[PDB]
Amino acid sequence: LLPVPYTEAASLSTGSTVTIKGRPAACFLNEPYLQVDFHTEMKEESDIVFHFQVCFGRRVVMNSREYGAWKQQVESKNMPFQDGQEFELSISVLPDKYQVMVNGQSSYTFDHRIKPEAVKMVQVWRDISLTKFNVSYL
Amino acid sequence: LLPVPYTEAASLSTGSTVTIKGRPAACFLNEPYLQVDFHTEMKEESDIVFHFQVCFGRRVVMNSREYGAWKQQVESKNMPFQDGQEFELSISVLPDKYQVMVNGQSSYTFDHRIKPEAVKMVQVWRDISLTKFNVSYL
């Protein structure tokens, strides 16, 4: 249903939740990727407050791009995504960090390096099909 | 125009040329990938006679997947692809190797590890839009 790369303007603060439903575009043997980037401007070259990159079946890396430069990457081996299955990815803004849940289970967190109020745009891209994208505020 | 991941059944021998026209789906700053895989069966989990993977603006890796296992990867830093531009990629089957041309210029080669006559399917995927795919025989 949704075009990939997927772009949507967005604002985030404490209590915001970004929810993504989709499925990998390839079998895990072929190592598809998923990337979710919280950008500071509508341009894709803009800074990235929160970068979330899944190499399905292998690892996750999280980072930020600040004044054009990648910072300290955080690596995680948690891999709750299942081969060939739909996933529901939810990214919640807490006061001190993002909490990333996959199919209802807390799987990753990432401390705010830039205030989330700096976010203007979310991009979801790489090797997924995308059926649902929502930003909600509570 | 063409769906990505793109799958097309194919046969290859000496004199075969696979021609791909497309453009990256992201700015090079965001490091999109391109992957071209020559498979031994119609299944995406099948062995890969020739694997060609571009990290736009960084490197290329080439390899083969034989009985399910990746082999010796070949790395190249040649990067003739231009940021934000259409490319024309042509992969020609010579008796002893594949020759990969990008916009008319020979840019990569890869010696046959498996006879090209074992190929049954070509997949073009990752972060590109695809406007043209052809297999031709001379």
Overview of this protein structure:
Chains A, B: This is Galectin-10. Two copies of one chain form a homodimer. Chain A has 138 residues and is mostly beta strands. Chain A is 0% helix and 56% strand. Chain A is built from no helices and twelve strands. In chain A, the strands form two sheets. In chain A, strands 1, 3, 4, 5, 6, 7 and 11 form a seven-stranded antiparallel sheet that branches. The first copy, chain A, has a five-stranded antiparallel sheet with strand order 10-9-8-2-12, with no helix packed on it. The first copy, chain A, is globular, with a radius of gyration of 14 Å. The two termini of chain A are 27 Å apart. The relative contact order of chain A is 0.37. The interface between A and B is medium-sized, with 14 and 14 residues.
**Radius of gyration computed on alpha carbons of chain A:** 14 Å
| Broad CATH class of chain A | Mainly Beta
Main beta sheet strand tally, sense and closure of chain A: 7 strands, antiparallel
- Total helices of chain A: the number is 0
Distance between the termini of chain A: 27 Å
Structural class per helix/strand content of chain A? mainly beta
Q: Note the overall shape of chain A.
A: globular
Strand content of chain A: over 45%
DSSP helix fraction of chain A: under 10%
- Annotation, overall tally of beta strands of chain A: 12
Key features?
homodimer; mainly beta; Jelly Rolls; 5-stranded antiparallel beta sheet; 138 residues; sugar binding protein
